[PDB]
Amino acid sequence: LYFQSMDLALIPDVDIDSDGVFKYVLIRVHSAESKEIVRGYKWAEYHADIYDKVSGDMQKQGCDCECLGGGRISHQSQDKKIHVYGYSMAYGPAQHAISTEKIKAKYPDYEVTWAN
């Protein structure tokens, strides 16, 4: 038979928390046909905690993941500013320019900035 792969269109490009500073990762999801997604959550003690949660979820849907890097996101809803910066020891620094491309697409009325 043939196996129907997850439509990546239905995987949110961005899922981040609000009003505060938190770890994030940039993940490549394979159908597996691939795209980069931003995931960042206040509950995560480590970047690896985010990647483990996300890649587990993806694996449930038959997708495979690669972590491309991480850092931090500062989300200020009051000021409609999102800043993406920093690094991950486990995964290296993400190319925050990619992350911000995603973020800006979802929060187009925000000032979306990066460093590096």
UniProtKB/Swiss-Prot annotation:
EC number(s) from the headed UniProt entry: 3.9.1.3
Catalytically driven reaction(s): N(pros)-phospho-L-histidyl-[protein] + H2O = L-histidyl-[protein] + phosphate; N(tele)-phospho-L-histidyl-[protein] + H2O = L-histidyl-[protein] + phosphate
Catalytic center residues: 47
Keyword Hydrolase: yes
Molecular function, one GO term: transmembrane transporter binding
Binding positions (substrate): 23, 88-90
Keyword Acetylation: yes
Protein name, UniProt field: 14 kDa phosphohistidine phosphatase
